[PDB]
Structures are given as structure tokens and as C-alpha cells.
Amino acid sequence: MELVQVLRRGLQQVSGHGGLRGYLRVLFRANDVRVGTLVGEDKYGNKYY
Amino acid sequence: RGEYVVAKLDDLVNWARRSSLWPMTFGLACCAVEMMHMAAPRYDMDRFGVVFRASPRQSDVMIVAGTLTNKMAPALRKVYDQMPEPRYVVSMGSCANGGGYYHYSYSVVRGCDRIVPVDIYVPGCPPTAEALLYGILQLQRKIKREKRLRIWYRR
Amino acid sequence: SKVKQDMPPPGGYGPIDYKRNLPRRGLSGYSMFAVGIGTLLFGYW
Amino acid sequence: MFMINILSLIIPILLAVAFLTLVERKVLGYMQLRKGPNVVGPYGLLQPIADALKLVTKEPLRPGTSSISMFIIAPILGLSLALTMWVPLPMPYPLINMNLGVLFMLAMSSLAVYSILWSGWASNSKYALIGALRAVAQTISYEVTLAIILLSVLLMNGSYTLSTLITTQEHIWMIFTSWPLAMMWFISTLAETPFAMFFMAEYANIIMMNAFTAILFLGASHDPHTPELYTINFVLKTLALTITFLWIRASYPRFRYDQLMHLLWKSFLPLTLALCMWHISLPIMTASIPPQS
Amino acid sequence: MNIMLTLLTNVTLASLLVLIAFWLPMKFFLVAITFLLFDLEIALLLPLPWASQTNNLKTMLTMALFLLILLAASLAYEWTQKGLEWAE
Amino acid sequence: TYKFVNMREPSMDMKSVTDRAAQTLLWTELVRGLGMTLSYLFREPATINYPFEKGPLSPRFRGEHALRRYPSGEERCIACKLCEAVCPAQAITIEAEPRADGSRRTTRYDIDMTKCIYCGFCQEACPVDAIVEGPNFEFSTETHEELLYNKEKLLNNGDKWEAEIAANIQADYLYR
Numbered sequence: 078m079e080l081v082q083v084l085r086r087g088l089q090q091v092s093g094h095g096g097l098r099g100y101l102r103v104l105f106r107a108n109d110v111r112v113g114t115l116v117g118e119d120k121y122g123n124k125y126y
Numbered sequence: 127r128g129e130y131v132v133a134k135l136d137d138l139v140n141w142a143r144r145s146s147l148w149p150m151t152f153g154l155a156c157c158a159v160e161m162m163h164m165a166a167p168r169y170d171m172d173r174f175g176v177v178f179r180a181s182p183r184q185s186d187v188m189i190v191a192g193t194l195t196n197k198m199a200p201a202l203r204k205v206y207d208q209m210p211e212p213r214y215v216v217s218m219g220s221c222a223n224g225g226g227y228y229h230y231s232y233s234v235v236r237g238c239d240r241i242v243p244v245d246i247y248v249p250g251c252p253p254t255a256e257a258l259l260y261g262i263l264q265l266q267r268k269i270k271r272e273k274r275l276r277i278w279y280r281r
Numbered sequence: 282s283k284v285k286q287d288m289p290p291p292g293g294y295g296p297i298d299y300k301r302n303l304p305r306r307g308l309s310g311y312s313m314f315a316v317g318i319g320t321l322l323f324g325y326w
Numbered sequence: 327m328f329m330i331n332i333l334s335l336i337i338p339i340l341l342a343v344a345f346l347t348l349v350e351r352k353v354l355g356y357m358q359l360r361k362g363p364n365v366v367g368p369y370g371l372l373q374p375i376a377d378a379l380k381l382v383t384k385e386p387l388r389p390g391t392s393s394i395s396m397f398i399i400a401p402i403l404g405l406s407l408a409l410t411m412w413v414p415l416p417m418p419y420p421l422i423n424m425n426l427g428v429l430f431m432l433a434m435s436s437l438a439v440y441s442i443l444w445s446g447w448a449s450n451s452k453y454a455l456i457g458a459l460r461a462v463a464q465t466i467s468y469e470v471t472l473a474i475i476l477l478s479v480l481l482m483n484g485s486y487t488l489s490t491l492i493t494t495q496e497h498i499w500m501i502f503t504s505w506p507l508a509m510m511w512f513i514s515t516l517a518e519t520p521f522a523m524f525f526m527a528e529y530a531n532i533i534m535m536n537a538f539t540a541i542l543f544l545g546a547s548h549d550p551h552t553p554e555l556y557t558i559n560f561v562l563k564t565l566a567l568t569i570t571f572l573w574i575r576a577s578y579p580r581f582r583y584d585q586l587m588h589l590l591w592k593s594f595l596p597l598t599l600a601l602c603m604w605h606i607s608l609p610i611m612t613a614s615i616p617p618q619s
Numbered sequence: 620m621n622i623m624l625t626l627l628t629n630v631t632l633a634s635l636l637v638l639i640a641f642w643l644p645m646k647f648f649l650v651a652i653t654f655l656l657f658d659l660e661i662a663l664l665l666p667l668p669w670a671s672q673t674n675n676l677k678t679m680l681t682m683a684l685f686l687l688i689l690l691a692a693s694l695a696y697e698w699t700q701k702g703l704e705w706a707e
Numbered sequence: 708t709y710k711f712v713n714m715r716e717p718s719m720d721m722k723s724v725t726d727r728a729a730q731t732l733l734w735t736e737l738v739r740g741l742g743m744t745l746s747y748l749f750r751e752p753a754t755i756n757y758p759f760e761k762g763p764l765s766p767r768f769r770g771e772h773a774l775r776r777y778p779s780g781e782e783r784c785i786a787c788k789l790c791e792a793v794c795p796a797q798a799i800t801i802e803a804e805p806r807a808d809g810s811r812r813t814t815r816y817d818i819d820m821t822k823c824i825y826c827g828f829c830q831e832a833c834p835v836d837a838i839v840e841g842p843n844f845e846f847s848t849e850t851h852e853e854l855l856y857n858k859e860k861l862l863n864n865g866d867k868w869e870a871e872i873a874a875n876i877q878a879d880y881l882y883r
């Protein structure tokens with residue numbers, strides 16, 4: 078059943094980066110896709126995890 | 127327009143040239159073993175994709191790391207000659223950059239510049255792994271902004 | 282304030298293994314040979 | 327349309343030659359706690375394109391003391407060979423069902439030694455001369471183990487027709503009858519295997535050797551109506567073998583030459599002879615000689 | 620017709636690839652003889668798969684075994700009298 | 708106290724020789740090598756994404772240098788020349804002058820960045836914490852002239868890297 082949860086936890090992972098466009102954005106711009114809790118924002122758009 | 131085509135072909139060619147380097151590493155001093163620390167899993171200088179050894183003829187960028195003494199002076203210049211174009215060298219460390227801690231010594235050329243032309247100057251004694259990997263990324267962007275095919279069409 | 286520097290816990294520290302922990306794994310020498318002929322004899326049959 | 331079938335083989339094999347390199351670096355990468363190419367495209371999918379077009383844009387420097395004629399035909403043969411032994415493979419139905427396919431495979435794969443021999447001679451360097459000499463003697467040493475293993479294997483098959491291999495195995499994988507030979511065969515395949523070419527030549531040899539080992543020892547069931555069953559089974563088996571082929575690439579210190587000859591002529595050749603003697607009488611021993619027709 | 624056609628296109632793509640590639644931008648001899656002598660012995664024992672279906676199979680078994688015994692003897696001799704051991 | 712590293716002898720009983728013959732004829736120690744790296748294959752990688760995240764550092768980190776200034780904005784340097792004397796590669800060259808106001812600070816401060824060795828003697832030599840090495844390490848260049856620093860560039864970095872320098876020295880002035 079762990080495969081189900083692992084395959085499950087990869088899906089709201091896709092929802093975490095907004096929609097499909099957001100996930101494709103982070104994958105093609107960072108090659109990292111894992112999402113994290115927001116911590117803070119600088120005055121540049123440099124959004125942090 | 128031919129100008130647009132030469133721009134697209136320019137972008138297509140160097141995108142490989144900014145993603146498929148092969149470093150001929152010159153293991154000389156503490157900067158050299160520090161490079162192999164970058165190729166270690168903690169930093170993965172092979173994920174961008176440049177092989178740690180790369181052999182003489184199978185190489186693009188020659189990372190001059192360590193003190194460059196006149197003992198090795200002609201050996202490196204003959205090696206730089208054998209390096210096929212496009213060839214770039216990244217002088218790593220204070221010793222290879224200007225001489226560093228042995229600038230006034232009798233048996234070291236002050237800076238790798240006096241022997242070969244350098245594209246990227248990464249400072250450090252030794253430079254921290256990412257501090258040189260960033261320099262590689264700096265060389266990566268330096269390849270992005272070239273007008274090779276554009277200049278040829280302009281001529 | 283009292284002196285505070287990098288000091289070990291009062292019980293010192295937990296035990297650190299250092300001997301060779303090479304694992305003792307695998308079946309007996311005759312056992313590998315016995316199955317080896319077993320699969321073979323099955324093979325030709 | 328038979329010509330279209332050739333391009334429907336040569337190019338995808340050429341791409342197959344191109345695309346398992348990212349598999350190699352990432353398998354070799356993830357093995358050593360590393361990641362492998364993953365920044366250029368999604369998971370390095372475009373990494374092969376990132377290197378190939380760079381290589382073709384790199385000027386091919388030629389040694390001053392190099393015979394151009396040999397320096398350019400040695401890769402010609404090297405690629406010509408590397409994409410020729412893919413033609414008689416009994417993959418579903420082979421392009422060429424040569425009745426002597428095994429012999430053709432051996433004669434033309436043993437011809438690869440000329441490419442490396444010419445490359446060392448044409449390069450005309452102290453490194454190139456010995457390296458060609460070492461590579462060729464290592465190679466020419468190892469067909470005698472190759473030929474005997476394949477010969478002794480084929481006694482229980484029936485002939486050298488590569489298509490007949492499927493009928494022979496059918497019930498069980500043929501390794502279960504010759505597993506001492508499989509390790510004998512698999513190890514020998516490791517050592518037998520311009521500069522832009524030489525990637526392609528030896529590399530198709532790597533996959534085809536494992537494709538050749540796949541059909542030989544680990545067969546599948548070819549349903550006459552549906553052929554996709556054999557396609558998936560053949561690909562899956564030759565992938566597992568190739569992953570193993572790179573599994574051992576970064577798992578042992580590389581052999582040294584004196585042991586390399588010592589390993590064969592003193593610990594591989596005499597045992598190969600015994601197994602051949604075992605597998606020449608056993609079909610006679612149990613009255614299980616196979617039909618050639 | 621079909622065979623050389625496959626060979627012809629194979630080298631042609633090999634030709635077009637390399638053409639655009641270079642236009643767009645005592646011991647060693649000793650065993651080599653022993654391999655030669657061994658390889659010729661290999662050819663003698665190659666037709667065995669058809670020979671296994673003869674009617675005189677009784678004389679085949681002794682004869683086919685004789686090569687492998689005799690071939691092994693050449694290896695055994697070559698090993699004992701220094702020889703096959705990697706010379707210097 | 709000494710420990711032998713190779714004095715074990717193989718027992719010649721049938722079980723041990725069977726182990727040895729089984730070890731070499733059908734390779735097992737080599738297969739154990741395969742099993743070890745296979746377990747390594749099915750393990751997480753330890754490879755960080757640069758520059759999306761980088762390896763951890765310490766408040767004592769020595770990197771790109773930067774002069775500082777007092778909360779008033781007045782420079783800290785007093786041209787006491789301690790840093791030049793101790794600078795082991797003589798990368799410090801400074802010239803003082805009786806500044807018109809009367810505070811009489813330095814006129815020249817050139818760090819030969821390609822001669823420095825990042826040893827950290829300069830910061831500990833300064834009695835007013837004027838010269839410090841910022842935690843920056845990505846300040847590479849394509850020109851030799853860029854590496855040769857000067858008073859203006861040093862002051863600019865102190866104006867640029869100020870949050871880190873103030874915080875790091877705040878986490879360290881009790882240590883040193």
C-alpha cells in the first residue's frame with residue numbers, strides 16, 4: 078500500500094506548485110520540484126522555502 | 127530574415143556548449159584536491175554534466191588549479207596548445223590567479239595569466255566548492271552571451 | 282555568569298563502535314555446489 | 327519498403343546507442359550517492375542532445391604524424407560493424423534469417439579488432455601504439471573463449487540459425503542448462519568490448535552483446551499471432567543485462583594485463599574446454615540430440 | 620540483393636556521419652601465435668552441431684573428444700614449459 | 708599495544724577449503740560487491756541544488772573582504788597599518804594622510820585579492836574591527852583587474868554586506 082501513498086504524495090506535490098504550468102515551471106527552471114513551507118519574502122521576488 | 131535564423135542557430139549551438147563542458151583538470155596543489163571534493167556527492171559537479179577526468183583531447187575547459195611553477199610552465203602551454211577549440215581555462219585559487227602565497231617566490235610565474243589566456247577568475251585559497259562551481263556557472267553564462275555565428279553573418 | 286564552553290554531557294557520550302562489522306552472511310560451500318548441480322540436472326532433464 | 331525497415335532499425339539503435347549513456351551516468355551517479363545529469367532538461371532527457379551537437383561542432387583535430395586514409399576508414403569500419411550485427415538478431419522476426427547467423431555474428435564482431443588496431447597505428451604515438459597493442463591482444467585472446475562457449479552452447483540448440491534459439495529455450499531459460507557457461511560467457515563479453523564515432527561503435531557492441539546474451543541464455547515465448555510479447559520480453563531482458571553490465575563498471579578495480587591473460591589462458595580456457603566436452607556428449611548421453619531442420 | 624543492400628546503407632550512414640564530423644567544423648607476439656594456432660583448432664571443431672546428427676555417431680564421439688583432449692594437451696604443454704605464462 | 712593486520716591462516720579442514728573453492732569458482736565476494744552498491748543505488752542522494760541551496764557554513768567564515776564603518780557612518784579604519792604588517796602574502800598596501808577634518812584616516816587601501824590567502828589574520832589584527840571578510844564566495848570575474856581591490860570597492864562591499872558582517876561578528880565577538 079506504500080506505493081499508493083507514495084504515488085499519492087506525488088500528486089498534491091503537483092498541486093503544491095499550483096497547476097500543471099507551475100510544476101513545469103519549477104521543474105524546467107530548477108530541476109527541483111519538492112515544495113516547502115513559505116518562510117518569508119524579500120523585495121525582489123526571490124521566494125523562499 | 128537571415129539575422130533571425132543566425133540567432134536561433136547561435137542559441138542552439140551554445141546551449142550545448144553551455145551544458146556539455148569537459149574539464150581537463152590540472153592537479154597541482156590544495157586547490158586541486160578541493161576540486162575533486164566538488165565532484166563528490168555533496169555538490170555533484172557531474173549533474174550539470176562535465177566528467178571529472180575528461181582526458182586531454184576529450185576536454186573543453188582546463189581548470190588551472192594550484193601553484194603554477196616554471197617547472198610546469200612549458201608542459202601546460204604545450205597542453206593548452208593541444209586543447210581543441212573552443213577551449214577556455216578557469217584559473218582557480220590565488221596561486222594560479224596571481225601567485226597567491228608564493229607571488230614573490232623565485233620558482234613560480236606570478237599568475238597563470240602570464241602563460242595562457244583565462245576566461246574566468248575564481249578567487250579562493252582554496253575557493254570553496256560552490257565558489258568555483260559558481261565560477262563554472264559564470265563560465266556557463268559567459269558561453270550564453272557569445273555572438274559567434276552572429277559576427278560571421280555581420281562580416 | 283558561570284563559565285560556559287563546549288563541554289561533553291555529564292555522562293560523557295554514547296559508545297562509538299570502531300571494530301570491523303563485516304557481515305557473516307551466506308550459505309555453506311557445499312550448499313552452493315549442491316544447488317548448482319540441482320539446477321543443472323533440472324536443466325538437462 | 328524493406329529499406330524503410332533498415333532505417334527503422336539503424337536510427338533507433340543509433341538513438342538507443344545515444345540514449346543509454348544518460349542511463350549510464352545516472353545509474354553510475356545514483357550508485358555513488360550522486361544524481362547524474364538532471365539539470366539539462368527534465369532528468370537529463372536532453373543531455374544526449376546537449377553533447378552530440380556540441381561534438382559535431384568541435385573541430386576534429388588530426389595528428390600531424392597521422393595517416394589520414396586509415397584515420398578516417400577505421401571509424402568507417404567501426405560504425406559499419408557496430409550497426410551491422412544488429413541485422414540478424416532474432417528479435418521477433420529477424421531482418422535477415424541467415425542459416426549461419428551465429429557464425430556471421432562472430433566473424434563480423436571479431437572484425438572490430440581492425441578498427442582499434444588501425445587507430446593506434448594511424449595515430450602514431452607511443453601511447454597509441456601500446457594501447458592498440460594491449461587492446462588487440464586482450465581482444466584476440468578472448469574469441470577462443472567466445473567461440474567455444476557459443477559452440478558448446480549450440481550443441482543443445484540444434485544449429486547456428488539464430489531464430490531456432492527461441493524454439494530451443496521455450497520451456498525454460500537456457501541458462502538453467504549451462505549456467506556455468508553463462509558466467510563464462512558474460513565475463514568474456516565484458517573485456518572484448520573519429521573519437522566522436524568511437525562512442526557509437528563500442529557502445530552498440532555493449533547493448534548488442536547483451537541482446538545477443540539475452541536471446542542465447544534467457545529466451546522468451548514467441549506467440550505466432552501476437553509478436554509484442556517477445557518484443558517486451560526481449561527488451562526487458564536486455565535492459566536488465568545492460569544495467570548489470572554497468573553495475574559492474576563501477577564495482578570492481580579494473581583488471582591488469584598480466585592477470586587479464588592469466589585469467590583466461592589459465593583459469594577460463596581450460597574450464598571452457600571441459601564444459602564444451604560436457605555439452606558435446608550430454609546430448610548424446612541422454613539421446614537428446616536436437617534437430618537441425 | 621538484400622544482404623549487400625543492408626551493408627551498403629550501413630556504411631553510407633557511417634559515411635555521412637563521419638563526413639559531416641570532419642567537414643562541418645616477444646611475449647605479445649608469442650601468445651598471438653598461440654591464439655592463432657588455437658583459433659585454427661576452433662575452426663576444426665565448429666561443424667559439430669551438424670556432426671551430432673550423423674549415423675556413425677559412435678565414431679564421432681571419440682573423434683570429437685579427441686580434438687578437445689588434444690587441444691587441451693597443447694594448452695597443458697604450453698603452460699608447463701613456461702611459455703603460456705606471460706613472458707617478459 | 709600493537710595489533711596484527713594480516714596473520715590469519717586459512718584452516719585446511721574440508722569446510723574451510725569448501726568455502727574457499729566455492730568463493731573463487733562461483734564468485735561470491737565479488738557478488739557481495741554488487742549487493743553493496745545496489746543498496747547504495749536504492750538510497751537517497753546527498754547532492755544539493757546550486758544555487759537553489761548550498762552547503763552549510765559557520766559564523767566564523769572567511770571570504771570576500773569588506774571594510775566597515777561605525778553606526779555614525781564614520782569609517783572604522785584608523786590606518787594603524789597592523790593588517791599590512793601581518794598580511795602573510797603582503798596583499799595589503801595602505802597609505803595614510805592627515806585628513807582635513809583631523810581624524811586622519813587612510814588614503815589608500817588596496818587588497819590584492821589574487822595575492823590574499825583568506826587566512827583571517829587581517830581581521831584579528833585590526834584593533835577596531837575595520838577589515839573583515841564577508842561570507843560571500845561567489846565574486847569571481849573574467850578580468851585580473853577586477854580582483855585587485857581598492858579602498859572604494861572595499862567600502863562599497865561594507866555598504867553592501869552589512870547585515871551579515873554585523874550579525875556574524877555579533878555571534879563571534881565572545882568567541883575570539
Ligand SMILES: CCCCCCCCCCCCCCCCCC(=O)OC[C@H](COP(=O)([O-])OCC[N+](C)(C)C)OC(=O)CCCCCCCCCCCCCCCCC
Nearest residue numbers: 318321506508509512513574589593594731732733734737
Ligand atoms: C554435473 C555438473 C556439470 C557441470 C559442472 C561445472 C563445474 C562446477 C561449477 C564451476 C564454477 C562455476 C562455473 C565457472 C565460473 C568461473 C570459474 C572461474 O575461473 O572462476 C575463478 C575466476 C578467477 O579467479 P582467481 O583468478 O581469483 O583464481 C583462479 C584460480 N587461480 C588462482 C589458480 C588462477 O574468477 C574470476 O575471473 C573473477 C571474475 C572476473 C570478472 C569480473 C566481474 C565478475 C562479475 C560477477 C557478477 C555477474 C555474474 C554474471 C553471470 C552471468 C549472468 C547472465
Ligand code: SF4
Nearest residue numbers: 192219220221251252
Ligand atoms: S591559492 Fe591557496 S589553496 Fe590554492 S593552490 Fe595556492 S596556496 Fe593552495
Ligand code: SF4
Nearest residue numbers: 794823824826827829
Ligand atoms: S586574509 Fe588576506 S588580506 Fe587578510 S591578512 Fe591574510 S592574506 Fe592579508
Ligand code: SF4
Nearest residue numbers: 784785787788790833
Ligand atoms: S583595516 Fe584595521 S588594521 Fe588595517 S589599517 Fe585599518 S584599522 Fe589598521
